[model samples]
Target: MSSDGGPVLGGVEPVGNENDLHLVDLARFAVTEHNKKANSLLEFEKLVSVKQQVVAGTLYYFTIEVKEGDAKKLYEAKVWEKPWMDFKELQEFKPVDASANA
Candidate 1:
């Protein structure tokens, strides 16, 4: 859904209820370099699904799952931004082993 003005991967607007997640801005992620950095070896799963709450402009809790091995590796992600963005060290554990109780 977010982009640096590059390619669009895939998009799907699902029709459903509160539990269903409509990927309004799904886009293709075809960045070879990006994948390399993302640790593509780890299986990425949606630990939490995306859903829009009654509030606007806010994304609901959507933690994703990575490979079990991804834990213990230094992983960082951008959480907030103004001039550009900021980095947040997710955790010192495998992304797959963590869970955000949504």
Candidate 2:
């Protein structure tokens, strides 16, 4: 945990640390997706939830929930890499990964 007692990633909270799972990771991921449309990160102010499933020991599927002011949104992501893997891959803004999330 960082000084804020939250998970740390890339020297920042909730954005890095390949081997661990954190709410901030999901939050930042949400920002990346929201950015693609609005091109702005300031629109979001909080992370609401993160739902995940593991596949074949490495791949991870996440259904992230967040709030935009008083409204809620859901976003999905598929990740097939981690700290112990030789390669890493991440795909986001999908309906859901049919390959996993069961």
Candidate 3:
């Protein structure tokens, strides 16, 4: 079709159209968990991107921008969900930056 590439991970595909209700909810859960553990109130600013992988459940890959006080930051989140069971868990939540690697 356009410049969009096909799925590289087979079952995994880009779902980031931005402001999707369910993806945003998934991102929110990650932020909530992070705040509880990190003990820092980081307001969720935006959802940058999202990917979904189908396995036992859906593995949500979310890149979210958050407001850490006055500082803006991005964190990629790994969340797994089984909506049938109404359960979701945040796995990996870590900070990242554009084209910045360590």
Candidate 4:
């Protein structure tokens, strides 16, 4: 994890270590449909309620949930060869506390 305790995303770190899952920066939001077997859609809940393992080199855009008992989500994100300006608008997700882990 990066200094903020959140997984790195698209080579751009957000303002802080914590961010709400509802926010667009949350990676799980964008990658679910792309990996349904690994991630399921709680359409009504609008969240990935189970654990998932994302393939590296693909964009894993979302926040992570880390509680006292579970292994912390780990990631090493990179956006090599892409235009720098394209990543300027992106943000890093905050590490979710157990209260927010749902």
Candidate 5:
């Protein structure tokens, strides 16, 4: 199925954008990195959705879905990756409402 309510912000569009291979890595980085930084014991499973912005390297926005013993929830992460220096980090962190669809 198509990712409705499509993102048409030129380069921000998923149709023709950043490489997807690293998307998964960044997703986990967002999850694992936060686990250590915060007291939350959440684990990673499925990556619900993603959108990215390119700067010096890349800024990946991952919407990760995880089971919390009962129901699943989502996250909004700003993961910045700079391959030039072999660097990565979770910048902005927050939880997303179920209504997110882009």
Candidate 6:
């Protein structure tokens, strides 16, 4: 279980002897870092989900789904060599369908 009252998913799992960190953890960490840098506190409503892709060596794109109020919001961030190494360059961008209210 995760802090958001949902099952944490994706990463080393039943296949591994011990549980490993998962995408929801990364998403929460990303949001926390974003708040820390901005000098603001943002509440976690719910973790919608996450989408990711490997770009290169260890660089990847993470599309995180978060819920704000009643609407689901999407945030995209890059991960460097490690999960917490390089993160949170997240910005408000208009998606193909609509604008993100980040």
lDDT (10s digit) by residue, model 5, range 19-79: 5667766776777777777765666666767777876676767777666556667777668
Candidate number that wins on lDDT, 2 or 6: 2
So what's the TM-score on candidate 4? Answer: 0.22
In model 2, pairs of residues that clash are 9-16, 14-24
Q: What lDDT, from 0 to 1, does candidate 3 have?
A: 0.80
lDDT of 4: 0.33
Q: Candidate 1: where are CA atoms >4 Å away? A: 1-41, 49-56, 68-102
In candidate 1, what are the lDDT values of residues 34-83, reduced to their tens digit? 35577554444333333223222222222333443554232221111122
Task: Give all TM-scores, in the order shown.
Answer: 0.26, 0.39, 0.70, 0.22, 0.62, 0.43
Identify the candidate with maximal lDDT: 3
Query: Which candidate would rank higher by TM-score, 3 or 4?
Result: 3
User: Residue pairs in steric clash, candidate 1?
Assistant: 9-27, 9-28, 10-27, 10-28, 71-93, 71-94
Model 5 segments more than 4 A misplaced:
1-10, 15-21, 96-102
Off by over 4 Å in 2: 1-23, 33-38, 41-57, 67-71, 94-102
Runs off by more than 4 Å, candidate 4: 1-26, 39-63, 66-102
Candidate with maximal TM-score? 3
**lDDT ranking from best candidate downward:** 3, 5, 2, 6, 4, 1
Count of backbone clashes, every candidate in sequence: 6, 2, 0, 9, 0, 0
lDDT over C-alpha atoms for residue 2 of model 2:
36
For candidate 4, the clash count comes to 9
lDDT (Cα, tens digit) per residue for candidate 3, span 1-102: 555664444777777866588888878788888888888677888888988888898798898888888888888888998978988889965575447558
Model 3 alpha-carbon miss at residue 53, Å = 0.8
